[PDB]
Amino acid sequence: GVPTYGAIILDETLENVLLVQGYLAKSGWGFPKGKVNKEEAPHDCAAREVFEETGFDIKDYICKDDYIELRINDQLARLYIIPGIPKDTKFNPKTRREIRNIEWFSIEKLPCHRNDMTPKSKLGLAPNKFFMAIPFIRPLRDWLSRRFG
Numbered sequence: 001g002v003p004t005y006g007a008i009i010l011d012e013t014l015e016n017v018l019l020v021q022g023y024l025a026k027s028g029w030g031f032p033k034g035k036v037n038k039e040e041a042p043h044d045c046a047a048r049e050v051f052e053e054t055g056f057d058i059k060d061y062i063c064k065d066d067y068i069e070l071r072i073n074d075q076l077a078r079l080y081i082i083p084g085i086p087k088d089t090k091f092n093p094k095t096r097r098e099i100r101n102i103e104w105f106s107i108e109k110l111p112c113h114r115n116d117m118t119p120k121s122k123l124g125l126a127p128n129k130f131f132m133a134i135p136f137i138r139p140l141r142d143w144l145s146r147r148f149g
């Protein structure tokens with residue numbers, strides 16, 4: 001799969017993360033990210049996509065060693081960790097045809113898994129509007145614990 005790059009932007013308290021809401025197949029909340037172009041460096045793709053989806057330019061803040069990367073059905077998603085972005089930053093998605101909304105979410109309030117349907121004797125997972133973000137939540141929490149204590 002074509003790899004994707006983007007960012008986990010946190011505020012000054014490290015409590016909150018910036019999520020974006022897409023449309024249609026991507027109707028729920030996820031991290032800002034997108035597909036690398038031919039001959040584009042990972043960090044450049046992350047800045048370009050995040051600027052398209054948030055209106056915020058991370059280029060000067062990216063630490064090239066600080067990221068969470070997951071393989072999800074043989075597509076790599078790498079999200080560069082960007083702490084310390086003020087909560088009052090004015091975000092303005094560029095791609096309004098793809099981005100419904102942009103908001104800060106409390107890390108401790110986000111799910112790190114979806115719930116089963118064992119109460120209904122039914123297989124599978126209940127819908128959750130954070131499904132795109134969820135796989136990154138436990139890895140983020142662990143990464144923060146280590147880097148900040």
Ligand SMILES: c1cnc(N[C@H]2CCCCNC2)nc1
Nearest residue numbers: 021022026030031032033132
């Ligand atoms: C898996 C799939 N997509 C995502 N994030 C997308 C969030 C919604 C806006 C469109 N582009 C980024 N995260 C994990």
